Design a protein around this ligand. Structure first.
Ligand SMILES: *[C@@H]1O[C@H](CO)[C@@H](O[C@@H]2O[C@H](CO)[C@@H](O)[C@H](O)[C@H]2NC(C)=O)[C@H](O[C@@H]2O[C@H](C)[C@@H](O)[C@@H](O)[C@@H]2O)[C@H]1NC(C)=O
Ligand SMILES: *[C@@H]1O[C@H](CO)[C@@H](O[C@@H]2O[C@H](CO)[C@@H](O)[C@H](O)[C@H]2NC(C)=O)[C@H](O[C@@H]2O[C@H](C)[C@@H](O)[C@@H](O)[C@@H]2O)[C@H]1NC(C)=O
Ligand SMILES: *[C@@H]1O[C@H](CO)[C@@H](O[C@@H]2O[C@H](CO)[C@@H](O)[C@H](O)[C@@H]2NC(C)=O)[C@H](O)[C@H]1NC(C)=O
Ligand SMILES: *[C@@H]1O[C@H](CO)[C@@H](O[C@@H]2O[C@H](CO)[C@@H](O)[C@H](O)[C@@H]2NC(C)=O)[C@H](O)[C@H]1NC(C)=O
Ligand SMILES: *[C@@H]1O[C@H](CO)[C@@H](O)[C@H](O)[C@@H]1NC(C)=O
Ligand SMILES: *[C@@H]1O[C@H](CO)[C@@H](O)[C@H](O)[C@@H]1NC(C)=O
Ligand SMILES: NC(=[NH2+])NCCC[C@H](N)C(=O)O
Ligand SMILES: NC(=[NH2+])NCCC[C@H](N)C(=O)O
Lengths: 254, 152, 254, 152
């Protein structure tokens, strides 16, 4: 693991905690390797828990979001010219492990081009589990540490699924204590409903569109909507205009 | 301050040989593309995905695992109401009704503690809570880690 | 009218438009006099329309809000020590007339102490009308000018009511062209409904409270709720905590 | 900038003899109290007030009067949804469906033009629109005065 250690990133300021990154092969056959990044807590906070953080998409990188513009330790300067320290970084209190997943995302990769057209929850979960198990073998001092899993959005799927594997598995080196999900998928049907309601309640769609959304999408899945649902959806989208759907009252980027 | 263009910097920064090198990434030069924040293809070629996660919730809850769900209340992508209804369907009992949680002088958001699961909203935060309400996000993190309900 | 002219207010900066204020007796018997304040548009914009602006409450002053911390021409410095110019003042384009009403509000007053315990829509409307009619006699150059009425909140009642008088009245010196209401009462029942819904949709009340509100308040009036409705209401209020109900995502004053 | 304490300044400023004098107010000294932003008593002693304003709307609409209703979308006192339902009940026909209106590069809010009445929301504004979104408030004012629909 000593080998995954980062001396210093270009443009990085001076800090008082270690960081590590590298790969871990989760399917020797297919040649699937997932990239990780771990930012620890300063020594005097040690031994702290371990937290695996996951972004969603599906298809989005945990390094790019989680670690680079959310709770990670640094923030990227403009024009990607350096870093700046995030005062609110979660690694002020925990050892945070960022995972690019699945394979094909971020820096994670596959030797079997097909993989990228064939992703799914299941495989994603089994790969993450594998990754862990090995990961602990590479970082044996983490064995038995309190451990938690967390992420956003599509990770609403990831977290619980993976949490379930870990749990069923019964590996003892892994002390899973719980998890946490933010703004995440949970139940297609309810989420569809709450989704439209909130939209209408935030002045974003006409009364008709709203009604249409309820009619088009209710039997669909969030991730594989019907054509009807999509149509309803194209309209709403037009009614919303140019705002940032992820943060209603903040500005769009130029 | 807030800058809505951060994705753009990240993209620039992680595509430098400098950096990849310092990360031990793209070792060979064998990652035949540019580094992107999300994988398009993956995103458009997704396969299996259940419609509900509730059953799993039930199982883990039953396992004694600590479960916390949260929401940025100005997010329109996976809005607070979707979550309310979803958690609502588990049908858990309430231990501590919807109440405002504070950080400093301000209200950070709301929270409801059910038997087996804690729900928290973050006042004014967008989809990426730690981006929009960093300080609040951290409090949430510490509490969660402690297994203690948000403060009043 | 020349007599209602303001030379300069203490702490006021230099400006290029005239301002006037004074009283107008609307019930010679009771001794009811309403105070007004008019901020005109700069000359080169003249002759512009006239706009009567009304705040609500009921019981709130149009001078205090409308004119002093909203669309009027100046903003009060801290500790009430002076003024500063509002760049977005509506009098950049129209002659704006701020009215304190009813009698007992702001600077408006009554010689019949009872008046203040006996206010109501009706009387408020008749008094406003009276006020106008006289007001025009005092500012004869405004006769026939395009005229509009507007206000917020409880003025949801005021505006339309008054607009209706004016209209039925048929006074010709008054060219009423329309009105505009912002965040205003319109229909008790619907407003009650939309109100709760939006609350629940903004994370402000528990699921139970919401349901309770629907049950307590639906047959009530916004301005004279039942005890049941009030009770439901006391709870909600507690669930909301210390935020600014008028602007959810901005800070409370210290 | 924003300052949530403005009511406090106003209170101070209008209670100066200086000022009242310059306003031609409280001529005699015969206004036997302190100047307050709102009259408590009045507020608590209100009498008549219909439950609906719709009938009047109908009448004025029928009169050809120009009618515009607006809403600050972050107001919780007389929230946007209350208005939507209320206008909704008039049952007017739609001429121009809910669409986003712009000011500069940003979306100022939304608008729907019915036959006889125009509805406008102001993105991000609180109860007092000209306080929270001054620039947007002014655009609204000019359009209204012109009888022209908000721009796209
Ligand atoms: C996926 O594709 C890469 C291109 O083949 C492989 O890299 C080669 O691996 C060979 C086998 O062990 C070997 O002859 C060379 O080390 C190597 N060439 C380069 C420059 O990459 C990957 O094979 C893996 O890559 C690592 C360098 C190391 O773990 C290898 O030993 C390993 O098998 C393939 N990646 C996988 C299978 O995860
Ligand atoms: C309401 O109360 C005030 C206290 O009585 C009245 O002021 C007095 O009015 C008398 C009558 O015309 C008069 O002898 C004095 O001018 C006066 N004293 C003072 C110092 O106020 C108000 O009477 C009105 O106040 C104005 C000064 C003027 O319009 C009077 O002529 C007027 O009647 C009463 N205000 C009303 C009736 O609106
Ligand atoms: C892996 O390393 C590469 C080296 O700097 C780079 O892959 C690159 O892609 C570019 C063209 O498609 C090219 O400008 C560059 O020279 C290059 N290597 C070549 C010629 O094959 C990537 O940035 C990097 N891949 C990632 C980020 O996964
Ligand atoms: C009307 O003028 C008054 C003068 O400055 C003042 O009424 C005042 O009220 C205060 C006490 O209740 C007192 O401090 C002051 O001297 C005074 N006049 C008296 C002694 O009768 C008010 O500010 C003003 N009333 C308003 C604003 O309506
Ligand atoms: C879940 O994932 C493992 C890993 O690839 C496989 O055995 C199957 O995908 C499994 N379940 C399925 C797909 O039925
Ligand atoms: C409306 O108002 C005028 C003015 O005081 C009075 O004639 C009555 O209040 C009227 N209508 C009523 C109350 O029935
Ligand atoms: N503003 C955006 N485009 N955000 C994309 C981030 C969503 C991503 N799936 C996550 O895990 O957060
Ligand atoms: N933040 C407040 N307390 N605002 C009170 C203003 C409400 C008032 N009725 C109006 O006409 O605007």
């Amino acid at each position: 693991h000593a080998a995954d250690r980062i001396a210093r990133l270009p443009g990085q300021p001076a800090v008082d905690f270690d960081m590590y990154s590298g790969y871990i092969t989760v399917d020797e056959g297919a040649g699937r390797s997932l990239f990780y990044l771990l930012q620890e807590a300063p020594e005097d906070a040690q031994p702290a828990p371990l937290v695996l953080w996951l972004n969603g998409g599906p298809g989005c990188s945990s390094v790019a979001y989680g670690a680079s513009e959310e709770l990670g330790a640094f923030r990227v300067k403009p024009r990607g010219a350096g870093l700046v320290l995030n005062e609110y970084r979660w690694n002020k209190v925990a050892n945070v492990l960022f995972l690019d997943s699945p394979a094909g995302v971020g820096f994670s990769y596959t030797n079997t081009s097909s993989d990228i057209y064939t992703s799914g929850d299941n495989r994603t979960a089994h790969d993450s589990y594998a990754f862990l198990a090995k990961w602990f073998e590479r970082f044996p001092h983490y064995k038995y540490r309190d451990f938690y899993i967390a992420g956003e959005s599509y990770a609403g799927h990831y977290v619980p699924e993976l949490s379930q594997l870990v749990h069923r598995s019964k590996n003892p080196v892994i002390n899973l204590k719980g998890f946490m999900v933010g703004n995440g998928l949970i139940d297609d049907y309810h989420d569809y409903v709450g989704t439209f309601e909130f939209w209408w309640n935030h002045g974003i769609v006409s009364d008709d569109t709203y009604r249409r959304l309820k009619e088009a999408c209710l039997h669909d899945s969030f991730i594989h909507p019907s054509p009807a649902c999509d149509a309803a959806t194209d309209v709403a989208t037009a009614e919303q205009g140019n705002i940032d759907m992820y943060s209603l009252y903040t500005p769009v980027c130029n | 301050s807030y800058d809505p263009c951060t994705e753009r910097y990240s993209t620039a920064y992680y595509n430098r040989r400098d950096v990849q090198m310092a990360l031990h990434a793209n070792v060979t030069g064998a990652m035949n593309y540019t580094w992107a924040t999300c994988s398009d293809t993956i995103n458009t070629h997704w396969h299996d995905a259940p419609r509900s996660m509730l059953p799993i919730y039930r199982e883990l809850i039953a396992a004694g695992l600590r479960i916390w769900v949260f929401s940025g209340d100005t997010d329109a992508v996976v809005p607070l109401t979707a979550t309310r209804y979803s958690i609502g369907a588990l049908g858990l009992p309430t231990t501590t009704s919807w109440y405002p949680w504070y950080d400093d002088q301000e209200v950070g958001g709301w929270s409801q503690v059910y038997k087996g699961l804690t729900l928290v909203s973050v006042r004014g935060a967008g989809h990426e809570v730690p981006l929009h309400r960093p300080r609040q996000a951290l409090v949430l993190f510490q509490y969660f880690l402690q297994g203690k309900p948000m403060p009043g």
